[PDB]
Ligand binder design. Structure first.
Ligand SMILES: Nc1ncnc2c1ncn2[C@@H]1O[C@H](COP(=O)(O)OP(=O)(O)OP(O)(O)=S)[C@@H](O)[C@H]1O
Ligand SMILES: Nc1ncnc2c1ncn2[C@@H]1O[C@H](COP(=O)(O)OP(=O)(O)OP(O)(O)=S)[C@@H](O)[C@H]1O
Ligand code: SF4
Ligand code: SF4
Lengths: 298, 507, 289, 322, 324
């Protein structure tokens, strides 16, 4: 398997923990067989196999989770750098202040604020769901289940536009929690770096200040910053329950807590093991990236 | 021509026999299927469904239904319907529920929670085919509501021809996962927890729906449903915020439909618990609560203060009973005489609820906590998660519990029998754990009687016996606010809590 | 002449003061705590009293307001001001507990995983990726079974959910520090492992942990507001800013006060821990000394 | 009796990967050095800048274990990990680092740095260790003020003296000094070397004194060892190796030393031709590409350490001549 | 002049009791002129160079009466322009090469940045010119050592690598803060001959800082002696070491290994550099000088200029034979 070690102790580990947890006995032994043969059982509400029930929505939570990080990073890092280059300035207090105002409102209230301001009052963006309700895909096509890819290849007469305009408020509400972390961590780390001797050498060589920032300082600040990216992708897949409820997203957070309220033991035993597997792949990629940013730890 | 309806939550599946949640019946039964009998929209009157004409034996044990001619099924992609509606479909639709030998009974998780608890496997002694066009039910004992029980959404007529086609093709789960019925809107797609797409049934026997297609846009937050409704993203919406009612009344392009609901909220006493096994105590805690404040501070004017268990627009309503009106010094006089002036501690379990038009039970529980504290009896609000709440409630662990209930079959036995009788007490639907013989002798004969003018009097007596004993503090009757865009025409509200799109059109 | 020697705490303080915003944030947190421990002398009413004459009474400074209810009234009719001054009592507790516990356990396991080797690193990373997979709510529901209805069933859930961050960030520093030459010199001196971790390496690891600690206090509250959208972690008559804000969401467009004020109680506490963490950072940075 | 310190064909090879995905190279960093060291002696180690000297220092101090070879202290194996014994042996061998700023922990006052060895290894109390630290600091000409300073608040010649102070604190048997005086002004270089000699004569310390300045090892050495491309090329008393350098590399080495005296200056014996690559060492003798005495055998076989009356030499011309 | 320093002073610590790490130094450097700086470790040689570069941060502060480079004034010209000026025309070797280099790039990128910035070549020229430079500097294997990280170099390779990229700068003025310290003699001679070749070919100026005198005796034109923060002596290179005017240079030269037999205890000047808390008034050398009169104790000597063109900060300059 594509895992560096502890392979069967991991598969047994997340299963016995989740089994134990959700049943709050030989059923454990029986269930392990089934998933080891290659299927995670049948759901108790929808009465369909767990993998056919997991795939269509795991492609809903990744499509938003990645779209939130692209936002969280494209904004988080540049801001987080400037916040350090201009320590104590207006910019410093403004930028980081707004970051923490966006954080300080729990997801319900400020999600409804963006709806009422941007969607209801200003008339800029559609309110909720993946595509406008009265536009549907022809199922005959070999569609993957990522609405952006599906509408990009097979949609008609501006349907891709709609499929993205429905993403941007969900993205902003989810990605503002990571955004806070990014900004605080980028600024924090960068400060620690800007005083070091090799940055003083970079001044002496006659480089432009932007090059000293983005080439010399930034690469030495990136280890805590990629560490928080990896930690936040873990919660954006497993969690997200409250952005999924407000924006009517057909995600995995709803499905997994709803399954636990109906006591569908198969979907809880299965979806949590699966999510563990996908978190390990992201952890091992960021742990591989540590040695790409810093040669001395390879 | 199209509608978008902004549904409260995703349906548990697409055959109503297997399920209890109201949103599942609004997705799976109102658009999709038809029934032997049905309630006429805007009433609880029973009228001809799939049966043109029906007959009743003088002894009340045998019912005969003369099925319609020409009733057709929808063109599923898995299957072409070869045949019209025949008795052979109806006798299947209850043999799937009555006895274990049927080859579909345990397909797709044959739990039948709505049927097994209703007593229809005890009351239906047999179902018999008369001919290709006639069905009969023979019942063990006479029950007056049975005609309305065949009208409610758990009964539905399912194709034996489609069932046998999918069974011979080795995949019988497609009977319930891929629905075929006789109803006005039949299924096209179901995006999981996102959308449900229906198409107007071309061949429908009744009034052809004026909309060509209907879409459900599942949106579990009320405030977002209203946010959708402002900019035409829905055209119809369920169960509004009590908060928003003012704005909604004031809005220029929403016709706020309004009706007195068949929904009763109450707090029920365990009469078997040591502070509540004396009736005096139960009277005091009823004099202690200001119902007239709760209809402002929980319902914002969306509630009528309740004298008795029945909704006030119903037949058999006893208007002559007094109410135990807000009077702390009487509540103290009762606890004094009782010897409980020293006070006591009570648990009060709030409740998360799956059906629409439930009250905000957290707000009621903390209000009632203050109201009893001001008469010398403090309370602790408990909010165990629904599965643990139900587990501990069947255990009898509680002293008092919040509940709401709705008029499911349109007749008072949905309240007195289903919610306060001894027959509901071992099932756990009657949370009061009470059985005052004199009530049973007024509910059991009232179900086994022909004359409505005698049923009315026995129910008028049942309300008086209930008022003397106080098995629950009966609080307020919700008014069902049901917003509809000003462009929508022909919508009529259902007192039962169901959304009937068959007759709508959009301007 | 040579000045009087300064104790490490005195030195810390002296370099702490040079940051003005850090002093402002400290001063703010210290009065928010002073309010909390004395709200039963300071606050104008018992927050269990419903004033039913004044349902949704706006603040004093708006039409229909009265000076009795300075902040106005909630929809059930209780005084908002008393509900915030009492709500600090459990909110601060939750936050402090969560943060402290989580931080502690994360520093220890993340130092062990970063310093000792690779087998222990793979075990602790297996544990951490398992921990990120279990939802917070799930944990809560579990704990309900473990224990009776208690604030602990929340606290312990929050702790766990938060713990993978403090474990993994500590390791991300210790991997850069352990192969720098001062660790080598310490080793050659005769320093044992535990010392190398908690005295020689750990002071260099504080850069990111301050950040994650200062956001932890906000999380501790926002998570309890998510738990309080469901039936979890609190009971109605005892206020808590997360529960209080999540119990009033339906009014946010009709009654601004009730929703906004608790939002300020969270926000001014988040901004205070941000400014306090910037000073604590600067209080440890040697290049500023 | 077994020598205080003994090395037998010590080898250390470093893996070099062009990237995260790339073919692996192997840098030839130490190719089997051998020597004996005794109580009170200095072994000076001299030769090219980039020829194995700090690598040899990191083996000898147990900073790294070698890729083959053996290493013995008082007849006790160093490489065979004995956790129980390591406690005792650890202190007895010490390091002074090259470019020692990186060896000082940025977030601890130099007083703590100096106290740490005594804290770990001795029973001296909080103020007694302060006293000790001050004492030591004063021996190298470090002021009392510095006790409260941080490592970034110094110059190179103070950082080196800080590092010397830390190494010489414990009363070690062996000090492996990687360029201990390379950033000191002469007026204090004399004070540090006088401390190292006072210690050597008082306690019986031994030094592996790595240097580039030959003037210093002409004074501080009993024995001198010459290294080129990870291999020994000459060994013997500094009297022998200054008076009669036989190996062709040592002649070109000692005949480029600066001198202040105008009349002691000589035009240097220049070297030309491609520097051997420590990745792809040339066949046989390392110095053949630059050497002026090159025969045929030079590009075919490698010279081992032959003896000529105590001056060990690794060359073929020398053999030819003997 | 290409560099002029009327007065310069750098303080560290707060204003109530400042450490006077550089104290009213003054010197000039002509184009094509080599100036040696020598004297006790702690006397302000690196700080004096860093302050010209403008590389002094918060905890310290720069005082100067006038400070000029190439016809522009580093206090009247703005930061945005004075940084461009000094960085473009001045380059510095730093004292520790291991921490001066960036730990997260390959040596080829590290050098090929400077070559791109200061000479504008294409990608294939930048490769070849880093090979050429590392070659000429004396690198064992240029083709392979470009791909090596600064922690895989050892000290005396990292030092040659930064001498290499500093020469790539094409400076008008190079400050060599100890360019020979971790280098063997046989290579020391290659470095110094390279620098002096540059100095001749390109009219390049050179400020060379050393703790070892013979290198600057041969190489330098002019020598500045710094002690305790201030210039104690100045003059011609050759002259200085033959005939010292200041008691400090006499006590600096008399300590060298050339003046003792093998394993004798070497001579030195006793005591320690002044602190901030024990700094004596008048001549700072007072506590250590053997010729200290009461005028030395009472009054700080001026930077007196002798008739032989030299300068010494002393009340009684030494004769050609060893006495005031
Ligand atoms: N970690 C490493 N990875 C790769 N090569 C290394 C590493 N450490 C040292 N080297 C190589 O080891 C060889 C010898 O290095 P050292 O022994 O440290 O140098 P040295 O002979 O003491 O030279 P100095 O530092 O200039 S006096 C050189 O070819 C180095 O490039
Ligand atoms: N940041 C600082 N804060 C306080 N004192 C400092 C600081 N930087 C340097 N010093 C002091 O200034 C003097 C060192 O100045 P440098 O110019 O670095 O010394 P130097 O003459 O170059 O000595 P070298 O490098 O050893 S040859 C010493 O007295 C130090 O104690
Ligand atoms: S063996 Fe040959 S090549 Fe090597 S040093 Fe001796 S003469 Fe030169
Ligand atoms: S002024 Fe006096 S003490 Fe100072 S250097 Fe001259 S002779 Fe010595």
């Amino acid at each position: 398997l594509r895992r560096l070690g502890l392979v069967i102790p991991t598969f047994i580990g997340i299963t016995l923990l989740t089994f134990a947890f959700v049943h709050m006995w030989q059923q454990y032994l029986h269930y392990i067989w089934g998933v080891m043969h290659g299927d995670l059982g049948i759901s108790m509400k929808s009465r369909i196999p767990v993998w056919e029930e997991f795939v269509p929505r795991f492609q809903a939570t990744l499509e938003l989770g990645v779209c939130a990080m692209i936002f969280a990073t494209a904004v988080g890092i540049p801001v987080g750098v400037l916040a350090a280059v201009k320590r104590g300035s207006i910019f410093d207090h403004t930028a980081v202040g707004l970051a923490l105002t966006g954080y300080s409102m729990p997801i319900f209230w400020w999600g409804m604020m963006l709806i009422m301001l941007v969607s209801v009052h200003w008339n800029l963006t559609p309110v909720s769901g993946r595509v406008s309700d009265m536009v549907f895909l022809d199922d005959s096509n070999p569609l993957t289940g990522f609405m952006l890819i599906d509408t990009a290849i097979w949609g008609e007469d501006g349907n891709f536009i709609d499929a993205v305009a429905h993403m941007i408020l969900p993205a902003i509400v989810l990605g503002t929690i990571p955004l806070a972390v990014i900004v605080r961590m980028t600024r924090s780390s960068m400060l620690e770096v800007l005083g070091e001797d090799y940055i003083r050498t970079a001044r002496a060589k006659g480089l432009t200040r932007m090059r000293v920032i983005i080439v010399h300082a930034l690469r030495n600040a990136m280890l805590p910053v990629v560490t928080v990216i990896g930690l936040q992708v873990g919660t954006l897949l497993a969690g997200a329950i409250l952005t999924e409820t407000i924006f009517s997203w057909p995600g995995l957070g709803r499905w997994l807590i709803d399954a636990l309220q109906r006591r569908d033991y198969p979907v809880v035993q299965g979806g949590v093991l699966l999510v563990a597997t996908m978190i390990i792949l992201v952890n091992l990629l960021v742990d591989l990236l540590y040695g790409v940013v810093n040669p001395r730890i390879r | 021509k199209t509608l978008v309806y902004c549904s409260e939550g995703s349906p548990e599946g697409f055959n109503p026999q297997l399920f209890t949640s109201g949103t599942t019946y609004d997705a799976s039964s109102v658009p999709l299927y038809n029934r032997l009998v049905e309630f006429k929209i805007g009433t609880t009157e029973v009228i001809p469904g799939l049966a043109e004409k029906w007959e009743v034996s003088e002894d009340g044990k045998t019912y005969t239904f003369h099925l319609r001619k020409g009733v057709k099924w929808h063109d599923n992609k898995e299957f072409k319907p070869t045949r019209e509606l025949n008795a052979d479909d109806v006798v299947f639709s209850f043999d799937r529920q009555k006895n274990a030998q049927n080859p579909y009974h345990k397909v797709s998780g044959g739990s039948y929670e709505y049927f097994e608890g209703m007593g229809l496997p005890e009351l239906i002694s047999e179902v018999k085919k008369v001919d290709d066009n006639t069905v009969q039910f023979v019942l063990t004992r006479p029950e007056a509501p049975f005609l309305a029980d065949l009208a409610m959404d758990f009964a539905s007529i399912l194709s034996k021809e489609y069932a046998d086609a999918m069974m011979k093709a080795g995949t019988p789960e497609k009977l319930d996962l891929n629905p075929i019925g006789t109803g006005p809107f039949q299924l096209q797609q179901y995006q999981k927890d996102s959308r449900i797409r229906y198409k107007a049934f071309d061949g429908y026997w009744g009034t052809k729906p004026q909309i060509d297609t209907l879409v459900f846009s599942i949106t579990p937050d009320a405030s977002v449903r209203y946010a959708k409704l402002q900019k035409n993203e829905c055209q119809v919406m369920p169960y509004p915020n009590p908060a928003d009612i003012a704005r909604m009344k004031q809005d220029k392009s929403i016709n706020l439909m309004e009706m007195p609901g068949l929904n009763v909220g109450y707090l029920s006493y365990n009469v078997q618990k040591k502070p509540l096994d004396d009736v005096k105590v139960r009277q005091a805690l009823t004099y202690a609560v200001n119902k007239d404040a709760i209809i402002k501070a929980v319902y914002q004017g969306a509630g009528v203060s309740a004298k008795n268990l029945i909704p006030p627009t119903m037949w058999g309503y006893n208007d002559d009973v007094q109410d135990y009106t807000y009077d702390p010094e009487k509540a103290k006089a009762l606890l004094k005489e009782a010897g409980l002036e020293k006070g006591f501690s009570i648990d009060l379990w709030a409740m998360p609820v799956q059906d629409p038009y439930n009250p905000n039970a957290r707000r009621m529980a903390e209000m009632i906590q203050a109201d009893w504290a001001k008469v010398g009896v403090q309370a602790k609000i408990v909010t165990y998660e629904w599965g643990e709440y139900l587990k501990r409630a069947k255990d009898g662990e509680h002293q008092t519990v919040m509940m709401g209930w709705t008029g499911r079959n349109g007749d008072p036995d949905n309240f007195f029998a289903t919610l306060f009788s001894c027959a509901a007490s071992e099932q756990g639907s009657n949370y009061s754990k009470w059985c005052y013989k004199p009530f049973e002798d007024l509910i059991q004969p009232a179900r086994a009687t022909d004359d409505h003018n005698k049923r009315v009097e026995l129910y008028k007596q049942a309300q008086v016996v209930m008022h003397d004993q106080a098995p629950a503090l009966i609080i307020a009757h919700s008014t069902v606010f049901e917003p509809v865009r000003k462009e929508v025409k022909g919508y009529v509200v259902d007192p039962l809590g169901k959304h009937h799109f068959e007759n709508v059109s959009i301007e | 002449s040579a000045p009087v020697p300064m104790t490490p705490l005195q030195e810390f303080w002296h370099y702490f003061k040079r940051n003005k915003g850090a002093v402002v944030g400290l001063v703010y947190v210290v009065i928010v705590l002073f309010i909390a421990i004395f709200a039963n002398w300071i606050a104008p009413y018992n927050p269990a009293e419903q004033f039913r004459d004044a349902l949704l009474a706006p603040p004093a400074w708006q039409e229909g307001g009265s000076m009795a209810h300075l902040l106005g009234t909630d929809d059930v009719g209780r005084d908002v001001l008393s509900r915030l001054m009492y709500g600090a009592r459990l909110s601060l507790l939750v936050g402090c507990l969560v943060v402290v516990l989580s931080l502690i356990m994360g520093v220890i396991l993340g130092l062990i995983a970063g310093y000792f080797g690779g087998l222990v690193d793979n075990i602790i990373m297996r544990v951490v990726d398992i921990m990120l997979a279990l939802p917070s709510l799930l944990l809560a529901l579990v704990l309900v079974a473990i224990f009776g209805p208690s604030i602990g069933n929340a606290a312990l859930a929050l702790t766990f959910v938060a713990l993978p961050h403090y474990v993994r960030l500590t390791r991300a520093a210790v991997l850069v520090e352990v192969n720098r030459d001062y660790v080598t010199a310490s080793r050659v001196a005769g320093a044992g492992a535990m010392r190398q971790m908690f005295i020689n390496i750990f002071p260099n690891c504080l850069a990111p942990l301050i950040v994650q600690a200062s956001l932890g206090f906000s999380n501790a509250i926002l998570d309890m507001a998510a738990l309080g959208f469901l039936g979890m972690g609190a009971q109605p008559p005892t206020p808590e800013w997360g529960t209080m804000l999540s119990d009033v969401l339906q009014f946010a467009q009709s009654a601004w006060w009730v929703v906004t004020f608790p939002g300020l109680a969270i926000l001014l506490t988040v901004l205070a821990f941000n400014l306090m963490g910037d000073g604590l950072r600067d209080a440890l940075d040697p290049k500023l000394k | 009796q077994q020598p205080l310190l003994q090395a037998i064909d010590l080898k250390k090879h470093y893996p070099v990967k062009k990237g995260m995905f790339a073919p692996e190279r192997l840098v030839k960093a130490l190719d089997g050095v051998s020597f004996n060291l005794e109580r009170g002696k200095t072994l000076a180690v001299v030769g090219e800048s980039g020829c194995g000297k700090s690598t040899l220092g990191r083996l000898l101090t147990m900073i790294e274990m070698p890729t083959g070879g053996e290493l013995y202290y008082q007849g006790q194996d160093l490489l065979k990990h004995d956790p129980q014994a390591q406690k005792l042996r650890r202190q007895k061998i010490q390091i002074v680092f090259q470019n020692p700023y990186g060896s000082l922990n940025p977030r601890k006052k130099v007083g703590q740095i100096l106290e740490e060895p005594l804290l770990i290894n001795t029973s001296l109390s909080k103020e007694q260790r302060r006293e000790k630290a001050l004492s030591m600091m004063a021996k190298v000409g470090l002021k009392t003020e510095h006790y409260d300073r941080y490592p970034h608040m110094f110059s190179g010649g103070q950082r080196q003296r800080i590092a010397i102070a830390r190494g010489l604190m414990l009363d070690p048997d062996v000090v492996i000094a990687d360029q201990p005086v390379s950033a000191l002004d002469v007026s204090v270089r004399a004070q540090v070397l006088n401390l190292m000699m006072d210690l050597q004569q008082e306690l019986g310390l031994s030094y592996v004194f790595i240097s580039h300045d030959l003037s210093v090892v002409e004074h501080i050495a009993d024995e001198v060892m010459v290294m080129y491309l990870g291999r020994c090329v000459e060994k013997g008393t500094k009297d022998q190796i200054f008076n009669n350098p036989r190996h062709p590399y040592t002649q070109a080495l000692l005949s480029a030393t600066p001198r202040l005296n105008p009349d002691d200056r000589r035009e240097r014996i220049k070297l030309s031709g491609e520097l051997p690559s420590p990745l792809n060492p040339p066949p046989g003798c390392a110095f053949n590409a630059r050497c002026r005495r090159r025969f045929g055998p030079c590009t075919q076989l490698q010279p081992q350490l032959k003896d000529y009356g105590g001056q060990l030499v690794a060359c073929f011309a020398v053999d030819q001549d003997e | 002049a290409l560099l002029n320093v009327d007065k310069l002073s750098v303080h560290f610590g707060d204003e109530s009791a400042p450490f006077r790490a550089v104290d009213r130094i003054s010197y000039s450097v002509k184009q094509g002129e080599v100036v040696g700086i020598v004297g006790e470790s702690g006397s302000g040689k690196s700080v004096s160079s860093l302050a010209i570069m403008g590389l002094i941060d918060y905890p310290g502060r720069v005082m100067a009466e006038k400070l000029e480079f190439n016809g522009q004034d580093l206090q009247r010209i703005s930061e945005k322009e004075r940084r461009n000026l000094v960085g473009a025309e001045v380059a510095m070797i730093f004292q520790d090469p291991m921490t001066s280099l960036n730990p997260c790039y390959t040596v080829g990128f590290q050098i090929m940045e400077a070559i791109k910035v200061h000479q504008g070549g294409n990608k294939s020229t930048r490769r070849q010119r880093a090979i050429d430079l590392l070659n000429q500097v004396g690198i064992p294997d240029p083709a392979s050592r470009l791909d090596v990280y600064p922690h895989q170099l050892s000290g005396g390779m990292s030092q040659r690598v930064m001498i290499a990229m500093a020469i790539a700068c094409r400076p008008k003025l190079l400050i060599a803060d100890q360019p020979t310290t971790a280098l063997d003699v046989t290579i020391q001679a290659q470095i110094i001959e390279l620098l002096l070749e540059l100095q001749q070919k390109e009219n390049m100026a050179l400020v060379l800082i050393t703790h070892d005198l013979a290198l600057v005796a041969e190489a330098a034109h002019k020598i500045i002696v710094m002690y305790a923060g201030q210039v104690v002596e100045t003059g011609d290179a050759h002259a200085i070491f033959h005939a010292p005017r200041h008691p400090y240079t006499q006590a600096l030269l008399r300590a060298l290994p050339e003046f003792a037999q093998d394993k004798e205890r070497l001579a030195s000047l006793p005591g320690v550099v002044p602190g901030k808390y024990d700094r004596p008034n008048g001549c700072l050398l007072n506590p250590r000088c053997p010729y200290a009169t009461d005028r030395c104790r009472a009054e700080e000597p001026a930077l007196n200029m002798l008739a032989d063109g030299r300068q010494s900060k002393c009340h009684y300059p030494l004769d050609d034979a060893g006495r005031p």
